[PDB]
Ligand binder design. Structure first.
Ligand code: ADP
Lengths: 96, 98, 70, 113, 709, 62, 54, 97, 131, 62, 505
């Protein structure tokens, strides 16, 4: 079975302490003991379980930077393979 | 039957139910099915179909030989080990050491 | 058919209606249109069209198909 | 062998271009001029194509490689290998370019035929 | 504050640039007035009047080196700028005033503003580059995204996105299709290399836009727009109606891509996509395993067709090693005199490839032995069946045969196979439709008959008749299928007409539309159907060995449509109340009586009306371009032109009498269906009296109108 | 299936993740995703892990 | 239709629902399987773009 | 390589020119179509800016933005692909090299 | 309307209790489904007993339609004359002329362009000038 | 290796909500280091590989 | 522009990847052995099992990325060397580039590194397959069974050593070592009780194939007392010797292919073995055997007719495809499809050193990817529905939409759709066959692409759709993000793999 530590310390688990209340008075002679722990997990208000919540820009920025580097390298390689220091711009371009 | 000391696969909460006996019998049917009499494997099902299936490798060999003869008639690619590379592997780096 | 309850945990698309469908549609239309324009430019970069009406292909031009010289 | 396949592909590309360049009213005669002869020359017997093995004689392979070598000699006679078909260092490339300039001057300095 | 400072700085920079360009143009003060000889007053004037110009240069000295540094970081080249020390290079670049030479800030801003102007669109650019590629890409991407983003956008959002994409695609194809049909446009668009096929061979993803492709795409797109407009009506409370619409959009996109094939790989990809789309679409009720059997049968048939097509394409490639369809059509005549040693037989090169193509078409375009999957494919929804039966899955074979027209021209196996098979299939489909009580089954059998007739027309050797028949049959079958689906929806998913009746009073719009569609589709006289039937009968060749059976089957399949159409119309609309009392009485409550009462959806009715009008207009335009005295059709790329057009231009009295005999058989069938008393009635004697009076009046009118007056 | 809720998104999910039975152990509930490829127990950076109470007791007894 | 209850009155016209995957959004275990898979995918994409695109 | 076509005469060419015909010749691609065009570069820059603005708006509204991110990433990728198509020495139907 | 109809009953997808052993002798011969499993193929014409009997019945019934077709063909052939149809007579060098030209060309019987001594006959798909 | 270790150690905090909350409750330099470092190392390695794999340094250029 | 840096970079990259893998394996072994006396998996929060597993996964990923970069460099170097040999025209100069050995690490087994493109393809495919198998092996390893965690790295190291050596003895020894890890995994990780006899049969068949291959290799070595392929080319074998060598190599490789009727071991293994092992066993071992057969066959010139081998491959393909309609077990059907694909692939290289190897390599890669996808789907189903037969599980798409969509996409890919690399490989192989035997090619296309395909689809479709009314209170959940990412990666590999440069294809 699972042997990890559930009570994490890297952050605080958001919990709603008002959902469940433990009985503390007027228990019947044969009544059962109330639950000691009644805290319920509290999810973020604007988190959609139906869609990915990743709203960051790091992945898109990295992809754009990689594409730009690839384009620059392609330009440099086209210049070098043609024996020119920089890309020579043709006067007219026609379809192939 | 589970292997000795089999660690339970508790995916999806380890919520499994009792299987249908007929379903289990059908699942474990082919792996246990066997012929009852020697030679009964031939006449089982369709005799002509079984004969054709068992003779298929010979028919395939004969067809391949006929096709090879036809190719030899027109000088096409033959079922021969064409060692045209003299043993040098495709794109095999051939460099010497200092 | 009369609508019946479906599991909220189940990721089903059975008669799913979104109140904010307008903004989602606008967002999925605009960037898609931009990508389509870029792809159209890329595809029209290399295109072949029949010669215009009244224009005849002089066979001496390199545009005419060439033959492999042995 | 790949170059023979490329020649067949060039003939096919020429046919495809003439398809868009010439209308069906005059495409037949235009193709019957010369193109169909080269298409028939560049066929399965002469080109490996889809055949897994190009079954040719030893002398046939010798002649094919000889023609390829003649084409290579013609291409490198103008220093066209760099950088598409030849990896040449700076000094070697410069010397070859100077020799090519001299050879081009000599060739263009000849009387017409 | 900031805005005022920016305005002042911009004005100063513009004035300085104007002065510099005005002084550096003559090449005299470009360095003299700029680089004044010390003279601290002159230095202050130069760095105070050109300060807006100078500062940018210093700014230009900042980003450039850094960018160069980025280059040195990103390329490990240029050796950075070790020649300088960042204090001389900056000073030189900042002090070099030739950078702002002949540069106008106002001109640059105005040009950038003019770079987003649409007023300079012009029409020649549209002629030079068909924007329909952008529309098709948008439609495909919208369908893919809606499949991927079915949750973010609701049913309304998905419908709006799909409708917008499809309407843009349909609008794009209108002018371009008109130009292709009339101005004789052709195109080959290569979307880069696609896949390596042989050693050194890299086939490119190319598409061929031709007249046949344009016509097929236009017809399919119009039908799909009409269905998607009406599909929302039928699947009103459907659990996955957006899913059904998305599947329909995917199928339409696959059909359009298949019709726009440019290479043999593209045709195979299109066929595979059409097969997969049909397999998934038929599986509308995945929870139902009964339809799964029909879906499996259809998938098996499509896979067999795909295997046959792959074998044919492999043979063609082994023969020529060229995947370009245009080049192959331009080179198909080369290797006609050749054979391939298969097993112990030696068949001609054209014969085997043609047989494979014909078999693959017969598997797709339902023929004898392969039409079983077509009738069983009725388990799909109403719009799905309307799309599949009218075109695409049904029009694949005709389009494939027309695309490879030169290849099919010189095949003896095709010569003997096409006429007999087409006539037999048409006759069988007509006879089957004449006996089907289910609306879906009757429509499928009529579609099979129409496919057989189209195959027979393809055997005639005239492409224009085939194209006209395809367009008219597709439009009319789509309309009829929509009407039948609406009737079934009113009947609570009941397709059989044996338990239907009295629906004309319930659905007047549906009754009238069904009447018009049955008049057009059934080949009835005095319509597009009659014209198509006459054209098909004109072009028959008499050299066929099985000519008698072929002619008999053609006549029988031609005569059978009217009976089925009339039977369906009368049974659904004007027969006895054979439907359940619940279907009528529940809507017969007085409470429902209001200004919005309707047995069908107003959106569906309007879509049907618009589709019918557009189809009529397009058919009129096609008849004008083709059937008129002046042949306005572009080059069909066919070198085999028959003299059958002479009969259409000027026939003899023999063909006139043959057509008269056919019309007389049709009129006899109409009279029989008009007065046959299949059941006893209060007016059975009155029906006989009416029929006798009609016969007498017709005789009198024939006598008086031709001889008396 | 209607009452099913694995992540406790539509309905509150107690931290105990179960109501312990009066005669059954309060063992941890089986997670829906049983991926055992979990990294080492990660504590926050610069965490004081010295035994504070034990150090206080050592100071007291010394 | 005759009596078509709009989404305001419809008790069964569902909005977005259903979990994207079986993973718990509030999981506390330091699982790295999804992160490793994303890293592998991103590495493949970057390697394709950086030295093979042009 | 050879011309591959049946030769004609300049006198016949002039005679046809007197009739109003033309010889179809390649034309330069419009700046909107040219991948080496300032118009293409400005269009890419404007598209990138609008994509960033739309990403912000979708973050404010929750609408899908993966399509915008893909379009922005492909903005340089599309230019690279077009330039690669242009720089190739092979020809299919276009002007001869 | 007028009746608060409950939710759709679960009986709409009844669970099938397999009463007969699905023997391995019929593997994949029955489409299995937790609700209403079916046979792999459907024979809605079960009134016809066997394939041979069904074929005999179909051939017996098709005789009437064959006779009707024969009657139509006879009525057409006894009331019509042969027509004048064919390829375009003014164009003899097209589909017709090209065939004879190719049959007179026989370029597939020439020598190799490089002297390889291999002709079109040296192929599985070999040219044949006398088909 | 550094990029793989950093990305694993930065995005494998737990569930989606746990990762979001933890990354939110982090210093701005800490967030930048978590973001920049894993991508920066991979990008630099890719740049070095691309530079090595090409021959742009040839001196016979004009 | 081809400088000596590229060759040196490629050689150093290969050597460094091998040495880094060796160092990681040594570190992991030291950690595992020296952190516990019994070396059992610690059933506690602080355990070395998590650290060892993370180390193995991260090392595999890093080595895969480094191997991708090194394989790109090696392809560039091979293209440059091939051009340079073809570049030289004047007879005065010849290709003479003598490189020195690196100082940081020594040569593996004191042998120089030789590079082939097929070796790099096999290494990359094996790396990806082993990563997938290890990711799917989480639910199998437990206390006292965590020792098998590093077996995949050992197999990867063996493959790297084999695909970089030029000695036939080294190649044969490396090819023989993989049997022990496979037997150990089968005997200790399989959950099925019937898997004992299955493992025994698999070991027996693999040992028979190894014995045949070893007899052939010993004959070859004794015939010419040398250990170089160049020296082998410098010698000619007699007619009987060549025939016997070819027959023995074919028999061993076909027993390890597998081929009919030596496919009972493969069938039983795929029926009973653990999902991760079966994914790795089908993905890698068959490819290694094919690569060995191709390497040995090219190095030996044979004048005999390949009709026997071609007919054997065709008959095996036909037999594997025909049995699909009767397979109700998803694993069994996937095994039959994989057997058919393996027979088709082995059919390609029967034309000797002709231009048929590229199609075989492409088909091997496509089959590996498809088999990986199918095994992952089967494993996910057996984890969710706790079953592998279609009779007890139906209507998956109704309760598992993502799984149903993935299954449909996998079926579409397995159909050899035009966009997939299976289409290109099928086109090449069918073109070669029709060039040799047209009717045989048409028959092969008719059977596998339709009959076996129809059977696989009907078996897959019946489970794909339906209504899972059974076991309502125990219904399974949707696929985890790990499985979704694995499926996406597999699809991306299958699709984008067709866009690779044609210099090698
Ligand atoms: N596993 C099976 N073996 C043999 N026959 C079967 C099997 N499953 C279904 N059938 C056939 O399908 C028909 C349907 O049976 P079913 O309706 O379940 O039984 P009942 O009619 O008693 O309810 C039966 O007549 C039976 O012959």
């Amino acid at each position: 079975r699972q042997n990890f530590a559930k009570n994490i310390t890297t952050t605080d688990i958001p919990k709603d302490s008002h959902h469940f209340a433990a009985k503390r008075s007027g228990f019947t002679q044969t009544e059962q003991a109330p639950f000691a722990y009644n805290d319920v997990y509290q999810y973020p208000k604007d988190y959609k379980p139906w869609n990915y919540n990743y709203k960051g820009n790091g992945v898109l920025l990295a992809l754009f930077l990689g594409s730009a580097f690839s384009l620059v390298a392609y330009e440099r390689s086209y210049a070098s393979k043609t024996g020119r220091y920089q890309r020579k711009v043709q006067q007219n371009y026609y379809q192939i | 039957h589970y292997v000795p000391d089999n660690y339970p696969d508790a995916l999806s909460g380890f919520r499994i139910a009792y299987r249908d006996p007929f379903e289990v019998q059908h699942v474990f049917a082919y792996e246990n099915w066997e012929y009852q009499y020697d030679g009964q494997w031939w006449s089982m099902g369709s005799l002509a179909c079984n004969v054709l299936f068992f003779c298929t490798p010979l028919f395939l060999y004969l067809i391949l030989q006929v096709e090879e003869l036809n190719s030899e008639k027109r000088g096409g690619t033959s079922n021969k080990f064409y060692h045209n590379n003299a043993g040098f592997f495709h794109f095999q780096i051939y460099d010497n050491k200092q | 058919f009369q609508k019946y309850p479906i599991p909220r945990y189940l990721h089903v698309g059975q008669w799913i209606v979104n109140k904010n469908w307008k903004w989602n549609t606008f967002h999925m239309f605009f960037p898609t249109a931009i990508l389509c324009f870029m792809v159209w430019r890329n595809s029209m970069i290399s295109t072949a069209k029949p010669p215009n009406y009244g224009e005849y292909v002089d066979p001496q031009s390199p545009v005419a198909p060439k033959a492999i010289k042995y | 062998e790949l170059f023979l396949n490329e020649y067949r592909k060039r003939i096919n590309n020429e046919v495809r271009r003439a398809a868009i360049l010439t209308p069906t009213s005059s495409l037949r005669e235009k193709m019957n001029h010369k193109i169909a002869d080269q298409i028939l020359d560049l066929s399965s017997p002469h080109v490996r194509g889809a055949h897994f093995q190009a079954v040719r004689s030893w002398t046939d392979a010798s002649k094919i490689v000889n023609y390829v070598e003649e084409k290579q000699t013609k291409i490198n006679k103008y220093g066209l290998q760099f950088p598409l078909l030849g990896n040449m260092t700076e000094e070697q490339c410069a010397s070859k370019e100077d020799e090519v300039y001299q050879r081009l001057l000599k060739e263009m300095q000849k009387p017409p035929k | 504050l900031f805005l005022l400072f920016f305005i002042v700085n911009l004005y100063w920079f513009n004035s300085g640039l104007i002065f510099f360009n005005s002084v550096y143009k003559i090449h005299h003060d470009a360095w003299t007035l700029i680089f004044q000889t010390d003279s601290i007053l002159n230095k202050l004037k130069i760095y105070f009047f050109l300060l807006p110009l100078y500062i940018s240069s210093f700014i230009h000295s900042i980003s450039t080196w850094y960018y160069n540094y980025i280059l040195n970081f990103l390329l490990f080249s240029e050796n950075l700028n070790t020649n300088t020390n960042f204090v001389d290079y900056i000073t030189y670049n900042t002090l070099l005033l030739s950078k702002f030479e002949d540069f106008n800030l106002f001109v640059y801003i105005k040009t950038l503003l003019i770079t987003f102007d649409i007023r300079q669109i012009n029409l020649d650019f549209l002629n030079e580059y068909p924007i329909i590629l952008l529309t098709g890409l948008l439609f495909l991407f919208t369908t893919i995204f809606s499949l991927i983003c079915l949750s973010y956008l609701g049913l309304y959002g998905v419908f709006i996105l799909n409708l917008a994409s499809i309407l843009l695609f349909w609008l794009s194809m209108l002018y371009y299709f008109n130009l292709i049909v009339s101005e004789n446009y052709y195109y080959y668009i290569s979307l880069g290399k696609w896949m390596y096929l042989s050693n050194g061979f890299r086939v490119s993803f190319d598409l061929l836009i031709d007249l046949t492709s344009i016509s097929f795409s236009f017809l399919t797109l119009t039908i799909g727009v009409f269905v998607y407009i009406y599909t929302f009506s039928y699947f009103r409370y459907e659990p996955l109606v957006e899913r059904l619409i998305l599947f329909l959009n995917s199928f339409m996109i696959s059909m359009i891509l298949l019709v726009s094939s440019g290479n043999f790989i593209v045709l195979f990809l299109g066929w595979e996509l059409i097969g997969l789309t049909s397999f998934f679409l038929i599986n509308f009720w995945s929870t139902r395993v009964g339809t799964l059997k029909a879906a499996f049968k259809a998938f098996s048939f499509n896979k067999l067709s795909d295997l046959f097509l792959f074998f044919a394409i492999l043979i063609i490639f082994s023969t020529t090693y060229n995947l370009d369809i245009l080049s192959f059509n331009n080179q198909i005549y080369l290797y006609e005199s050749y054979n391939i040693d298969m097993f112990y037989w030696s068949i001609n090169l054209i014969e085997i490839i043609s047989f494979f193509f014909i078999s693959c078409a017969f598997i797709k375009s339902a023929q004898f032995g392969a039409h079983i999957w077509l009738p069983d494919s009725m388990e799909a929804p109403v719009p799905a069946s309307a799309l599949i039966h009218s075109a695409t899955l049904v029009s694949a074979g005709i389009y494939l045969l027309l695309r490879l027209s030169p290849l099919f021209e010189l095949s003896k196996y095709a010569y003997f196979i096409l006429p007999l098979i087409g006539s037999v299939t048409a006759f069988y489909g007509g006879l089957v439709s004449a006996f089907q009580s289910d609306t879906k089954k009757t429509l499928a059998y009529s579609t099979i008959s129409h496919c057989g007739f189209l195959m027979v027309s393809y055997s005639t050797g005239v492409l224009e008749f085939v194209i006209l028949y395809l367009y008219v049959h597709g439009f009319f079958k789509a309309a009829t299928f929509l009407c039948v689906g609406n009737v079934n929806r009113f009947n609570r998913n009941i397709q059989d007409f044996k338990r239907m009746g009295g629906f004309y009073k319930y659905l007047p719009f549906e009754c009238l539309a069904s009447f018009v569609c049955m008049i057009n589709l059934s080949g009835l006289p005095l319509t597009l159907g009659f014209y198509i039937k006459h054209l098909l009968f004109i072009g028959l060749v008499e050299s066929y060995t099985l000519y008698p059976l072929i002619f008999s089957s053609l006549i029988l399949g031609a005569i059978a449509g009217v009976f089925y159409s009339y039977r369906l119309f009368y049974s659904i609309f004007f027969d006895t109340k054979k439907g359940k009392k619940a279907i009528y009485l529940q809507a017969s409550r007085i409470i429902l009586n209001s200004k919005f009462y309707s047995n069908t959806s107003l959106a569906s009715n309007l879509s049907i009306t618009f589709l019918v009008l557009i189809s009529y207009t397009v058919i009129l335009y096609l008849y004008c371009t083709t059937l008129n005295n002046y042949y306005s059709l572009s080059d069909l790329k066919s070198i085999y032109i028959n003299n059958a057009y002479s009969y259409f231009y000027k026939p003899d009295y023999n063909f006139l009498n043959a057509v008269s005999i056919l019309n007389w058989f049709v009129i006899i069938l109409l009279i029989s269906v008009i007065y046959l008393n299949w059941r006893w009635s209060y007016y059975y004697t009155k029906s006989i009296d009416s029929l006798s009076k009609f016969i007498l009046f017709s005789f009198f009118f024939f006598i008086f109108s031709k001889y008396i007056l | 299936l209607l009452k099913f809720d694995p992540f406790g998104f539509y309905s509150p999910k107690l931290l105990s993740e179960n109501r312990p039975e009066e005669a059954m152990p309060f063992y941890e509930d089986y997670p829906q995703n049983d991926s055992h490829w979990n990294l080492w127990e990660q504590f926050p950076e610069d965490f004081e892990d010295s035994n504070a109470e034990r150090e206080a007791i050592l100071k007291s007894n010394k | 239709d005759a009596y078509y209850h709009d989404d305001t009155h419809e008790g069964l016209m569902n909005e977005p629902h259903g979990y994207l995957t079986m993973d718990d959004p509030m999981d506390l275990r330091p699982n790295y399987e999804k992160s490793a898979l994303e890293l592998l995918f991103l590495v493949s994409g970057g390697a394709i773009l950086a030295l093979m695109l042009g | 390589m050879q011309n591959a076509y049946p030769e004609i005469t300049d006198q016949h060419r002039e005679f046809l020119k007197k009739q109003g015909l033309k010889v179809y010749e390649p034309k330069p691609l419009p700046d909107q179509i040219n991948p080496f065009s300032k118009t293409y570069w400005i269009t890419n820059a404007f598209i990138i800016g609008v994509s960033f603005l739309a990403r912000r708006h979708a973050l404010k509204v929750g609408a899908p933005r993966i399509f915008w991110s893909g379009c922005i990433v492909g903005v340089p990728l599309a230019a690279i692909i077009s330039r690669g198509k242009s720089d190739q020495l092979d020809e299919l139907v276009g002007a001869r090299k | 309307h007028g009746w608060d109809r409950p939710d759709v009953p679960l009986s709409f997808n009844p669970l099938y209790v397999h009463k007969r052993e699905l023997s391995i002798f019929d593997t994949n011969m029955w489409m299995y489904d937790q609700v209403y499993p079916e046979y792999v193929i459907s024979y809605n014409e079960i009134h016809l007993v066997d394939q041979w009997k069904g074929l005999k019945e179909s051939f017996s019934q098709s005789a009437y339609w064959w006779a009707m077709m024969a009657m139509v063909f006879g009525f057409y052939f006894i009331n019509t004359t042969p027509r004048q149809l064919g390829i375009d007579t003014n164009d003899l060098k097209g589909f017709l002329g090209e065939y004879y030209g190719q049959y007179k060309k026989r370029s597939g019987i020439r020598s190799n362009f490089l002297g390889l001594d291999v002709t079109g006959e040296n192929s599985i798909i070999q040219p044949n000038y006398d088909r | 290796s550094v990029g793989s270790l950093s990305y694993i150690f930065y995005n494998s905090v737990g569930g989606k909500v746990i990762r979001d909350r933890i990354r939110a409750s982090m210093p701005f330099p800490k967030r930048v280091l978590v973001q920049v470092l894993p991508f920066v190392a991979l990008g630099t390695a890719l740049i070095i590989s691309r530079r090595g794999i090409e021959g742009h340094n040839h001196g016979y250029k004009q | 522009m081809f400088n000596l840096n590229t060759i040196y970079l490629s050689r150093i990259f290969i050597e460094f990847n091998f040495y880094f893998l060796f160092f990681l394996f040594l570190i992991s072994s030291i950690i595992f052995y020296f952190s516990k006396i019994i070396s059992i998996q610690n059933l506690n929060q602080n355990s070395v099992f998590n650290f060892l597993k993370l180390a193995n996964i991260f090392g595999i990923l890093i080595s895969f990325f480094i191997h991708i970069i090194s394989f790109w460099f090696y392809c560039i170097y091979s293209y440059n060397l091939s051009l340079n040999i073809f570049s030289d025209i004047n007879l005065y100069n010849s290709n003479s580039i003598e490189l020195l050995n690196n100082s940081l690490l020594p040569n593996y087994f004191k042998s120089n590194i030789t590079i082939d493109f097929f070796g790099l393809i096999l290494l990359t495919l094996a790396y990806i397959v082993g990563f997938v198998s290890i990711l799917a092996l989480d639910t199998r390893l437990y206390w006292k069974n965590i020792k098998y965690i590093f077996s995949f790295t050992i197999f990867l190291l063996i493959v790297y050593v084999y695909v970089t050596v030029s000695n036939i003895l080294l190649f044969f020894m490396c090819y023989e070592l993989l049997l022990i890890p496979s037997f150990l995994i089968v005997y200790f990780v399989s959950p099925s009780r019937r898997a004992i006899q299955a493992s025994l049969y698999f070991v027996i068949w693999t040992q028979l194939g190894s014995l045949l291959v070893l007899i052939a290799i010993s004959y070859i070595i004794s015939i010419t007392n040398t250990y170089e392929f160049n020296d082998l080319k410098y010698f000619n074998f007699t007619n009987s010797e060549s025939t016997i060598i070819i027959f023995l190599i074919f028999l061993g490789f076909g027993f390890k292919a597998p081929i009919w009727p030596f496919h009972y071991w493969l069938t039983k293994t795929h029926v009973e073995a653990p999902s991760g092992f079966s994914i790795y066993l089908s993905g890698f071992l068959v490819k290694t055997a094919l690569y060995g057969f191709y390497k040995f066959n090219t190095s030996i010139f044979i004048d005999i007719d390949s009709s026997i081998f071609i007919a054997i491959c065709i008959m095996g393909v036909v037999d594997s495809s025909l049995k699909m309609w009767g397979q109700t077990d998803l694993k069994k059907l996937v095994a039959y499809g994989t057997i058919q694909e393996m027979n088709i692939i082995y059919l390609a290289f029967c034309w000797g050193d002709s231009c048929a190897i590229l199609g075989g390599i492409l088909f091997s890669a496509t089959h590996a990817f498809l088999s990986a996808l199918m095994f992952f789907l089967v494993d996910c189903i057996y984890r969710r529905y706790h079953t592998r037969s279609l009779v007890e599980v139906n209507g998956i798409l109704h309760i598992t939409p993502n799984l149903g969509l993935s299954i449909l996409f996998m079926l579409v890919f397995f159909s050899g759709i035009p966009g997939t690399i299976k289409f290109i490989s099928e086109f090449y192989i069918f073109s070669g066959l029709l060039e040799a035997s047209p009717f045989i090619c048409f028959i092969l296309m008719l059977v596998a692409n339709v009959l076996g395909l129809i059977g696989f689809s009907k078996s897959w479709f019946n489970a794909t759709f339906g209504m899972p009314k059974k076991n309502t209170k125990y219904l399974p959940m949707d696929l985890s993000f790990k499985e979704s990412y694995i499926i996406l990666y597999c699809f991306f590999f299958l699709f984008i793999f067709s866009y690779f440069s044609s210099i090698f294809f």
